Amino acid sequence: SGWTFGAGPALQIPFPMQMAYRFNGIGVTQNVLYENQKLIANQFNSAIG
Amino acid sequence: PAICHDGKAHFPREGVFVSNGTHWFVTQRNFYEPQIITTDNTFVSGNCDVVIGIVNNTVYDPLQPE
Numbered sequence: 242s243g244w245t246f247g248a249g250p251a252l253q254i255p256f257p258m259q260m261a262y263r264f265n266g267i268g269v270t271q272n273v274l275y276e277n278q279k280l281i282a283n284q285f286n287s288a289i290g
Numbered sequence: 291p292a293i294c295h296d297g298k299a300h301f302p303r304e305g306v307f308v309s310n311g312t313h314w315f316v317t318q319r320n321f322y323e324p325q326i327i328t329t330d331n332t333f334v335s336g337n338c339d340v341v342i343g344i345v346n347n348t349v350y351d352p353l354q355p356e
């Protein structure tokens with residue numbers, strides 16, 4: 242649900258789109274995420290790993 | 291996450307692409323207010339195949355009818 246559940250009723254939203262919201266909040270447009278989604282997933286998985 | 295019209299992806303400038311099952315719409319983050327997907331509220335980037343979740347649609351611009 243992203244950050245919506247911290248502001249009211251929890252609103253479902255796909256996770257691949259949620260990161261596009263969060264990139265949009267640091268000056269990086271959505272185009273970076275979707276066209277590099279596979280790479281970013283591997284980096285995040287390894288970091289958690 | 292996107293719209294492909296002429297072999298090019300299309301991303302929402304400020305909003306998300308929302309469909310009620312038949313027609314697609316772009317609307318604000320926190321208030322449902324659909325608008326027709328034109329070229330001014332969407333910026334093009336990509337090759338229509340790199341993005342996962344592509345859906346075909348029309349993003350027709352106002353410069354063509356006039």
Ligand SMILES: *[C@@H]1O[C@H](CO)[C@@H](O)[C@H](O)[C@H]1NC(C)=O
Nearest residue numbers: 294295297343344345346347
């Ligand atoms: C969009 O149209 C192209 C050309 O007809 C087609 O190859 C492609 O499969 C379509 N997209 C989807 C999701 O079906």
